[PDB]
Every structure is written in structure tokens, then in C-alpha cells.
Design a protein around this ligand. Structure first.
Ligand SMILES: Nc1ccn([C@@H]2O[C@H](COP(=O)(O)O)[C@@H](O)[C@H]2O)c(=O)n1
Ligand SMILES: CC(=O)N[C@@H]1[C@@H](O)[C@H](O)[C@@H](CO)O[C@H]1O
Ligand SMILES: *[C@@H]1O[C@H](CO)[C@@H](O)[C@H](O)[C@H]1NC(C)=O
Ligand SMILES: *[C@@H]1O[C@H](CO)[C@@H](O)[C@H](O)[C@H]1NC(C)=O
Ligand SMILES: *[C@@H]1O[C@H](CO)[C@@H](O)[C@H](O)[C@H]1NC(C)=O
Ligand SMILES: [Zn+2]
Ligand SMILES: [Zn+2]
Length: 418
């Protein structure tokens, strides 16, 4: 039993659409909808539209009014909205990051925050470079009030840094720019090691290894396989394999990992080369509810809070908060509710890797009531009469339990493939 509980927030993929507004021509409500009629728009947004400022605002207002205390906050990026490149620019990107960064800093003057860059936090999107740049330097200025000179230094070099936490200074947050590894990123094609991030990672980890230090990885694009499709890593396979090895090697140091990018609530469990679970990974869903017209599903906006043991930074639990957008628009109020408490709904001990690996196995049971939950929660309770066939479920399961491609294919073939 632990004598006090550490808590920190994780917010991601804010995707602000400064255009949003209610008007009678639903093609004009928000530029992110790209000309489509916004399905049923309200003051807190629309499924076809990125986040109106007031949604983003209510999310942070709920945190401040939450009645939870927190040592820090993790912010995994993607702040500009989904509109085509010509419609945007480097300066707009920066104004948007600036607004977010300021808005947070105003409401949370005393709170430390550790950002990571996402793939839309650049113009043109996804083209995050190896060497310094206007955006990298822009954010370094904006995030000074939360970071070292040492941190800040590397931040401008290639979009990344690492940082002891003020209120727990043997906890080091490592913020990675995994956008360097994202498919669409033309800057990094054919590069052995973009911005020497692997070198610096291997280096930064090895260093924490010795100094009795625990590490939390923060980043935007997760490692592993995208769970709602077949044999597609989120990053470039090549890098995913490379990163997994690194995490394998130093898993004793890493006490948790945290990502966004997918806009969905997901867990993953890294196993050692031997096949034994050794690191827990957590992909938090987005604040924006945005989606394609052809897509049945999306997320409800979401916000989450983690719990740790201040001694070893072991992960005790996670509480997932959300907005029932439809309701929130019907009432025209920000009723940020609690969706679930992780150890409660799944009836497991903690967030250790063995704990979660065990839950994963329970999912594999024919008609697992457990997996059913996990799939409601996967789209942040968005439709709850939602269902899932054997194949989709297989693609989820394998993703949760297999991070590198050997073991992901074994899991796929095992049951069954073209
Ligand atoms: N509404 C949305 C928005 C993004 N996505 C997916 O999640 C990822 C989100 O990346 P961005 O947030 O950088 O667009 C994309 O790879 C996209 O395929 C989705 O499935 N539904
Ligand atoms: C998980 C949850 O809250 N789901 C609800 C449903 C309900 O029918 C709808 C109408 O308000 O709003 C939201
Ligand atoms: C941020 O953006 C929104 C709309 O674009 C505006 O109403 C809000 O006041 C701005 N706030 C800051 C701190 O820039
Ligand atoms: C949007 O809404 C109006 C009213 O339903 C409709 O007549 C019009 O065709 C729609 N336009 C598009 C692009 O969907
Ligand atoms: C999975 O994807 C990679 C493409 O990156 C491919 O080379 C590999 O052969 C594929 N595996 C299967 C089972 O098709
Ligand atoms: Zn995003
Ligand atoms: Zn993204």
C-alpha cells in the first residue's frame, strides 16, 4: 500500500479550428469539415468539425474545477486543425500552438506541462525536419516556462527534449518527436536515424539507468500496430522495430509510455524478446471529435488522469473523463463526466505490464464481455450500441499484445490470414 498518490493529466490532439461558429449554412460552420454539411453542430462542436475553442476551453475548465490535484500534465500535440495545406501556413500553425500554450499557462500558472510535437504541429503537416526550424524555435520560446535550457536546447534542434519533473525530480519525462518516424514525412525518407533521436534516446536512457531514475515516455505517434487495420504500423515499420528494441533493452527504466495520434483509447503491452510482458503503453483519445463523412464512428472528446506511486513511479490507475457531445450540445452545457476507472471496470490490480497482459488474455475469450467494454471505451463511449466482428477484434487483440512484426504476424496467422 502507498502513502500518497501522485496524479498527472494527459491531454492530446486538441485540434483547434479557429473557424468554428454556428451559422445556418452548415457547409460554412467550420473549415475542417472541408465543405461538407456539419452533421449537427453545436457550441461544443460537431463530429465532422475539429474543436471549437469553447470545447477545448471547457476541457481545461473541468480540469481546474475538477477537485483533483496534479503534479503535472502531459500534452502530446496536434493543435492545428484538419484542413488542406494551402489553406494553412507556418504562421497559423504557430498562432494556434501559441493560443493553446498560452491558454493552458493562464489557467494553470503553477502547473508544469510537458509537450510533445505532433504531426500537424508543422506546416506543411507531417514534414517535421531533422535540423532546426522556425516552428521548433517558436515552440522552444513558448515552452521555456516549463523546461530546462538543456531541454530547450534539443527542442529547437529536432523537436524533442527530456526533463526531470520539478515536483518529483528523479522522474524524467522523455518527450519524443515520433513524427520523424511517421510515414507521410518526406523529410526523413531513407534516413538511418533522423535527428539522431535513437542515439540520444539510447544515450538519455542509459544515463537514467545509472542515476536511479525512472522514465515516462511521452510522444505523439505511437509505436506498434494500428488496431483498426491489418499489418500497418503507425510509424514506419523500420523505425517501429528500432524503437521497440530500444524499449525492450531499457524496460526496467521506463515506468510507462503515453501517446496520442490515433484519437482512440488504447492499451498496449510491450513484451521482452523472450515473450514476457515488460512495459505498459497508453494511448489516450483526442479532445477533438472530428471524423470523415464515410466513417460510422468517432471518439467523444476525452481527458484523462493517471495515478502513480511517488516512490518508484509505478502506475496505479487511470481515470478517463469525457464529454457526451450530443448531450453537451442538446443542453448547451459542458458536462464533463467520468467514463471509467481502469482498475475498477476491468477488475485488475494496477497498471503493471503483467496486470494488463492478463486483461488482454481475458479479451481473447469467445464473446469476452471485457473486450466488449474495451471497444465501447475505444471510441470513448461514442455509440454504445456499437459492435465488432471476429476480424476487427482480432486486429485489436494482436495490436494490444504484439508490438514488433514477428510476434504480430504469429498472432495474425495463428488465427487466420490471406
Ligand atoms: N476522426 C479521425 C481522425 C483521425 N483518424 C486517424 O488517426 C490518425 C490521426 O492522425 P492526426 O491526428 O495527425 O490526423 C490518422 O492516421 C487517421 O487515420 C481517425 O481514424 N479518425
Ligand atoms: C454513454 C452515454 O452517456 N451515452 C448517451 C446515450 C444517449 O441516448 C445520448 C442521448 O443523450 O447521449 C449520450
Ligand atoms: C484563442 O482563440 C480563440 C478563437 O480563435 C479566441 O476567442 C481566444 O480568445 C484566443 N485566446 C488566446 C489567449 O489567444
Ligand atoms: C447542406 O444542407 C442543405 C439543407 O439540408 C442541403 O439542401 C444542401 O444540399 C446541403 N449541402 C451539402 C454540400 O451537403
Ligand atoms: C506486412 O507489411 C509489410 C509492409 O511494410 C510487408 O513487407 C510484410 O510482408 C507484410 N506482412 C504480411 C503478413 O502481409
Ligand atoms: Zn490528431
Ligand atoms: Zn497525429
Amino acid at each position: 500500500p502507498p502513502p500518497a498518490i501522485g496524479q498527472f493529466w494527459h491531454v492530446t490532439d486538441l485540434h483547434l479550428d479557429p473557424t468554428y461558429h454556428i451559422t445556418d449554412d452548415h457547409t460554412k460552420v467550420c473549415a475542417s469539415s472541408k465543405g461538407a454539411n456539419a452533421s449537427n453542430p453545436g457550441p461544443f462542436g460537431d463530429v465532422l468539425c475539429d474543436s471549437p475553442y469553447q470545447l477545448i476551453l471547457s476541457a481545461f475548465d473541468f480540469i481546474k474545477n475538477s477537485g483533483q490535484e496534479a503534479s503535472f500534465m502531459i500534452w502530446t500535440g496536434d493543435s492545428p486543425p484538419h484542413v488542406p495545406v494551402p489553406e494553412l501556413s507556418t504562421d497559423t500553425v504557430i498562432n494556434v500552438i501559441t493560443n493553446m500554450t498560452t491558454t493552458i499557462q493562464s489557467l494553470f500558472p503553477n502547473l508544469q506541462v510537458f509537450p510533445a510535437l505532433g504531426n500537424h504541429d508543422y506546416w506543411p503537416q507531417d514534414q517535421l525536419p531533422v535540423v532546426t526550424s522556425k516552428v521548433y524555435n517558436a515552440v522552444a520560446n513558448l515552452w521555456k516556462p516549463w523546461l530546462d535550457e538543456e531541454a530547450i536546447s534539443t527542442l529547437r534542434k529536432g523537436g524533442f527534449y527530456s526533463q526531470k519533473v520539478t515536483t518529483n525530480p528523479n522522474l524524467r519525462i522523455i518527450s519524443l518527436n515520433t513524427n520523424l518516424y511517421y510515414g507521410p514525412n518526406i523529410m526523413t525518407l531513407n534516413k538511418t536515424d533522423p535527428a539522431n533521436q535513437f542515439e540520444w534516446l539510447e544515450s538519455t536512457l542509459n544515463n537514467s539507468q545509472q542515476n536511479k531514475e525512472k522514465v515516462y515516455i511521452i510522444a505523439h505517434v505511437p509505436v506498434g500496430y494500428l488496431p483498426s487495420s491489418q499489418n500497418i504500423t503507425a510509424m514506419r515499420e523500420y523505425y517501429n522495430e528500432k524503437l521497440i528494441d530500444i524499449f525492450q533493452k531499457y524496460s526496467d527504466v521506463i515506468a510507462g509510455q503515453f501517446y496520442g495520434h490515433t484519437h482512440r483509447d488504447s492499451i498496449m503491452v510491450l513484451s521482452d524478446k523472450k515473450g514476457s510482458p515488460v512495459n505498459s503503453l497508453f494511448v489516450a483519445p483526442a479532445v477533438t471529435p472530428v471524423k470523415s463523412v464515410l466513417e460510422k464512428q468517432t471518439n467523444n472528446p476525452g481527458i484523462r488522469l493517471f495515478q502513480y506511486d511517488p516512490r518508484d513511479y509505478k502506475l496505479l490507475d487511470m481515470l478517463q473523463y469525457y464529454l457526451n457531445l450530443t448531450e453537451a450540445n442538446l443542453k448547451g452545457e459542458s458536462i464533463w463526466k467520468l467514463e471509467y476507472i481502469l482498475t475498477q471496470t476491468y477488475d485488475i490490480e494496477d497498471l503493471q505490464p503483467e496486470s494488463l497482459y492478463g486483461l488482454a488474455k481475458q479479451f481473447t475469450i469467445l464473446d469476452s464481455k471485457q473486450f466488449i467494454k474495451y471497444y465501447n471505451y475505444f471510441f470513448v463511449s461514442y455509440d454504445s450500441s456499437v459492435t465488432c466482428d471476429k476480424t476487427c477484434k482480432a486486429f485489436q487483440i494482436c495490436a494490444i499484445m504484439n508490438l514488433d512484426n514477428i510476434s504480430y504476424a504469429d498472432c495474425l496467422k495463428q488465427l487466420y490470414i490471406k
